[PDB]
From a paper:
Matriptase is a type II transmembrane serine protease that is found on the surfaces of epithelial cells and certain cancer cells. Matriptase has been implicated in the degradation of certain extracellular matrix components as well as the activation of various cellular proteins and proteases, including hepatocyte growth factor and urokinase.
We have also determined the high-resolution structure of matriptase:benzamidine complex for structural comparison. In the structure of β-matriptase-N164Q complexed with benzamidine, the benzamidine binds to the specificity pocket S1 right next to the active site and is sandwiched by the segments of Ser190-Gln192 and Trp215-Gly216 as expected. Considering the high resolutions of both matriptase-benzamidine structures (1.2 Å in our structure) and the relatively small errors of structures (0.4 Å in our structure), such differences in benzamidines are significant, and indicates that S1 pocket is larger than the molecular size of benzamidine and allows movement of benzamidine inside the S1 specificity pocket. This is consistent with the observed higher temperature factor of benzamidine (40 Å2) comparing to the average temperature factor of protein (15 Å2). The point mutation removes a glycosylation site (N164) and allows the protein to be purified to homogeneity. Gln192 side chain is solvent-exposed in the benzamidine-bound structure and forms the lining of the extended active site groove.
Residue numbers in the entry: 16 to 60, 60A, 60B, 60C, 60D, 60E, 60F, 60G, ...
The structure:
Amino acid sequence: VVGGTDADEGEWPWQVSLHALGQGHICGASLISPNWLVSAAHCYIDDRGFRYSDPTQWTAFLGLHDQSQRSAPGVQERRLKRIISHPFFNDFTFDYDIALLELEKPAEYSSMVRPICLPDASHVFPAGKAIWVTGWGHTQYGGTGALILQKGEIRVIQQTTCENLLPQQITPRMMCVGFLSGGVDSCQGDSGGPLSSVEADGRIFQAGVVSWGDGCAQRNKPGVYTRLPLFRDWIKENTGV
Ligand SMILES: *SC[C@H](NC(=O)CC[C@H](N)C(=O)O)C(=O)NCC(=O)O
């Protein structure tokens, strides 16, 4: 996250860190039930050096604050049983950039570990609404990951404006969130984490999944996120949640 601040300990108890064995933190995810996470499909694609698609290659840390303190009280370590990447994902366009991760043993709910609420299929997160991005990604483009979980406040951008900022790249699964003036944005290593939106009684709902961007925090280049209401039924069908 560029332009953000340190989160308070336990402020985002649905935020999860996904480590690939031997490589440290790669992506984020969100806790949605005792057994399931939501993340981004693009994080789980094999390359010639490493099989990112193989669930046995990963560790999820729940309740984490600081990447240098992964055994702190309240942090839970879990392996993955399965990675379900959306069947329509493609790694060229990044359309359908969403995956479901099945924990190998359930999470234990606590003050540090709590699921995010999922929005119904019909719910609209309106243009202009302030929402939050969180993660351990880079704090400047090309820069370094944060040890401490970061948060940043960003606003939903109108879809036609988003399309025109990133021509021939924005599908209806995507939404731009940020500022035309730049300054606050997601960045490398934030992918897969949740957008958190404060709803009408103060409960937080997941608005989207950190997906991609052109650079980070640049003028006229807000980050791109996968919309969540579109996938509510797909989540139910694949997870029972
Ligand atoms: S909607 C998912 C979360 N709800 C719960 O974990 C219910 C737990 C207890 N029954 C309770 O204390 O009410 C949730 O509300 N997450 C978002 C949030 O803002 O905390």
